[PDB]
Amino acid sequence: SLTTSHFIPFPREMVWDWHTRKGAVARLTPPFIPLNPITQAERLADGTTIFSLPAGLKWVARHDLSGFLNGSRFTDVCLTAPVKALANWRHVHNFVDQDGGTLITDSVSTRLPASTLTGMFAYRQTQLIEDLKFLSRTSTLFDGSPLTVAITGSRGLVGRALTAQLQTGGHEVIQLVRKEPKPGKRFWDPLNPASDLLDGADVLVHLAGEFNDSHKEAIRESRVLPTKFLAELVAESTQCTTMISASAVGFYGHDRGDEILTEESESGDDFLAEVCRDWEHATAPASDAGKRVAFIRTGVALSGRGGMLPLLKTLFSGGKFGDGTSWFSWIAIDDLTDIYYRAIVDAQISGPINAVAPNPVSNADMTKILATQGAEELALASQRTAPAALENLSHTFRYTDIGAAIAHELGYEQLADFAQQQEIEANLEDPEEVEQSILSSILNFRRKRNDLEHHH
Numbered sequence: 001s002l003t004t005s006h007f008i009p010f011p012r013e014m015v016w017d018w019h020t021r022k023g024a025v026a027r028l029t030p031p032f033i034p035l036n037p038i039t040q041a042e043r044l045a046d047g048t049t050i051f052s053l054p055a056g057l058k059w060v061a062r063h064d065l066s067g068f069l070n071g072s073r074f075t076d077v078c079l080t081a082p083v084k085a086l087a088n089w090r091h092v093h094n095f096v097d098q099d100g101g102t103l104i105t106d107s108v109s110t111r112l113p114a115s116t117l118t119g120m121f122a123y124r125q126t127q128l129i130e131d132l133k134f135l136s137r138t139s140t141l142f143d144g145s146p147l148t149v150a151i152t153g154s155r156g157l158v159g160r161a162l163t164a165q166l167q168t169g170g171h172e173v174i175q176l177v178r179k180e181p182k183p184g185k186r187f188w189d190p191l192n193p194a195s196d197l198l199d200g201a202d203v204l205v206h207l208a209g210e211f212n213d214s215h216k217e218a219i220r221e222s223r224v225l226p227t228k229f230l231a232e233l234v235a236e237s238t239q240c241t242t243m244i245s246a247s248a249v250g251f252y253g254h255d256r257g258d259e260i261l262t263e264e265s266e267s268g269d270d271f272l273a274e275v276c277r278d279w280e281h282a283t284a285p286a287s288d289a290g291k292r293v294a295f296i297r298t299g300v301a302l303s304g305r306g307g308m309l310p311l312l313k314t315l316f317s318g319g320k321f322g323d324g325t326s327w328f329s330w331i332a333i334d335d336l337t338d339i340y341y342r343a344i345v346d347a348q349i350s351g352p353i354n355a356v357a358p359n360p361v362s363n364a365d366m367t368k369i370l371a372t373q374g375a376e377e378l379a380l381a382s383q384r385t386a387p388a389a390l391e392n393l394s395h396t397f398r399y400t401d402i403g404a405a406i407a408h409e410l411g412y413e414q415l416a417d418f419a420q421q422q423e424i425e426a427n428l429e430d431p432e433e434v435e436q437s438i439l440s441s442i443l444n445f446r447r448k449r450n451d452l453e454h455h456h
Contacts, residue, residue, distance in 0.1 A: 001110035001428065002117045003437040005445045006125040006416035008102040010132050012095050015102040016071050018132065019093070020044055023164030027131055030123040031304030031333075032411035035059065035086075044074035057082045067092055085112060088428065094438050098445075104128075105441045109429045118424060119411035126413055127334075130398050134338055135169055137396055141346040148172040149344055150198050152188060152230070153207030153246070157306045158298075162205070162337045169341070174201055178208075190226035198233045203242040203344050206230055211254065211272045219275055227282035235289035243286040244343045247295040249329045249356060251276035255382045258327075262388040263297075263352045280352070292350050294343050299329035299356035299385060300378065301336050302402070304409035311375035312366075313410065321379030324364030329383040331357050332405035334398050339390070348393060356385040358400050369403055417445075 008015050018024060025037045034054045041047040041061075045068040051059040059082050067075025073094050081087030090109040095102055106121060149166055153159040154175040163173050175181075176188035176197060186197060190208070198204060209223055227245065234243045252261045253268015267273045280295045287293040302309045331339075336355055343349045361369075363379040387395070399405035407413050415421040429437060 001108045001112055002114040002121065003105065003107040003434075003441045004121060004415050004417050004420055005103055005105040005441045006129075007098060007445070008104060008129055008132060010101060010136070012071070012097050012102040015104070015128075015132070016095055018128075018168055019074070021168045021170065023167035025049060026160070026164040027168055028124045028127055030120050030411060031409055032123075033120065034305075036305075044068065045070075049076075053082055053086070059086055061089075064090075071095070085116075090434075092434060092438065094442075096442060099449075103442060103445055105438050107429075107434050107438050107441070109434060111428060114424045118415055118421065119413070122413035122415055123408070123411060125416050126408060130334065131165070131168065134341070134398070138169075138342060138345060141342065141348070146171045147202040147344065148174060148200055149203045149205055150174045150176055150186075150201035150240075151205045151207060152176045153209060156207065156210070157303055158246075158301060158333065158336060158340070159207045161303075161333060162207070162340050165337050165341055166344075171344075176208075191221065191229070193226070193229050193233060195233070197230075198237050198240050201237070201240050203244065204230060204234050204240055205340060205344065206243065206245045207340075209246065211250075211270070211275075213271050216271075220278075223275070224278050224282050227279060228285065231283045231286040231293075234286040234291055240291065242292040242344070243283055244294050244296065244340060245280070245283050247280055247297045247352070248272075248276055249297050249299050249354065249383045249385045250381075251280070251295075251297050251352070252383055252385070254380065256384065257382060258384060261329075261354070261383060261385040263354055264388070292347060294349050295352045296336075296339060296343065296355045297352055297385075298336060299331045299354075299360075299383070301333050302330055302405050302409055303333040304411065307333075308375050308378060309406070309409060311373055312370055312378075315375055316370050320364050320367045322363075324362055324367070326363040326379045326382040327360050327384040328363060328366050328378065329356050329360050329381075329385040330366075330402055330405070331355055332397075332399040332408065334408075335405075338398065339395075342395070351389075353389050354385050354387045355390075356387050357397060357402065357405070358387055358391065359402065360384050360386075361402055366402065369406065419448075 022040050036052045037049055038052050039050040041049040046063050046065045049061045053059055061076050061078055064075040064077045076091040078089040092107040094105040154163045166173050175185045177185050181187045234240045250272040251267055253270045253273040267277050283293050300308050339355045
């Protein structure tokens with residue numbers, strides 16, 4: 001079906017290690033395919049992983065012992081066919097040393113045409129490399145010892161991605177959940193949190209939550225009071241050093257025209273701004289007790305699997321809103337979790353942080369780009385936000401341009417092997433055949449690299 005290789009500029013021991021951790025499967029699952037891992041296979045050698053599919057269906061993936069070599073290879077297999085496309089699936093993941101880094105070869109046996117798998121693999125490759133680079137940059141910011149991080153909203157869009165990232169980084173997550181707690185998780189009653197809710201945690205990340213003054217009480221009860229009660233627990237804890245609390249660019253108001261909004265800019269003048277001021281001020285007990293507090297004023301998070309992006313993408317099955325001059329304050333979901341992750345470990349981060357890409361765009365421009373349930377009214381907001389505080393810290397963003405963020409999230413990226421990509425833009429394999437395909441793919445990579453070396 002498809003064999004293709006990509007180089008990762010990190011030691012094979014580190015790269016392999018990353019794949020063995022909780023969260024790794026979630027990180028590499030493409031957001032633009034309605035598949036989501038609901039369980040964690042203990043080990044790469046054997047053991048099964050359950051994926052949710054649409055319409056209550058499920059995919060049961062299994063690691064194949066016969067396709068395992070410690071530190072070099074693991075293999076995913078499916079024996080049952082929830083859908084024809086996802087059946088008779090055999091995915092070999094091969095890792096070799098390559099100039100001090102790692103050369104990964106993926107070989108999937110399946111009747112799906114290679115053209116069907118290009119997007120999936122481009123995502124797996126970019127996501128892996130960006131994740132490892134992020135961890136590497138971040139290692140410069142702290143001692144690198146694992147932390148324990150309590151998280152609310154750990155099941156939501158951002159929380160689930162952040163949780164998986166922390167776990168692949170070797171940190172421990174204590175999920176504070178509002179219902180159906182699993183072992184090792186803790187029940188969180190927002191209006192009456194347990195005295196011992198934060199025990200064992202070094203950091204609290206408060207993400208829980210999803211504009212007329214008619215909503216005031218409802219918001220006070222869901223956002224403001226729970227935030228305060230958590231802040232008090234942070235205050236009371238000797239081990240909890242830090243509260244990273246979700247906020248929103250809505251702090252600046254829904255509409256500031258062409259004014260460039262920085263963490264220095266005043267709060268807005270509408271009810272949205274008031275809600276956000278109160279939401280942030282509810283953390284006061286934590287900072288009063290001398291703990292580190294930051295407010296992650298988030299733009300609109302762009303994700304292939306939820307939130308506004310898929311809704312927008314659909315509204316082109318619409319058109320520019322009014323002037324088209326409304327400023328769309330956006331951030332790629334991976335950049336948002338990077339910012340949370342950094343805030344957790346980097347003591348330089350405190351106070352308000354604009355978690356937005358460096359480049360906000362006009363409604364008119366967003367409209368063009370999307371061609372080349374609340375979504376329809378996004379253009380009613382206009383927030384020309386700048387991530388000034390992050391830029392001042394020399395933060396690296398994965399996606400500075402919205403076109404590049406969208407390509408990543410909706411699956412329009414190219415295979416690392418550009419030539420192969422180009423060729424595909426023009427049958428199952430048995431084990432013996434698979435070995436040959438893999439060896440050949442490795443040889444191809446090396447022949448090209450050697451040629452490149454000679455050309456300088």
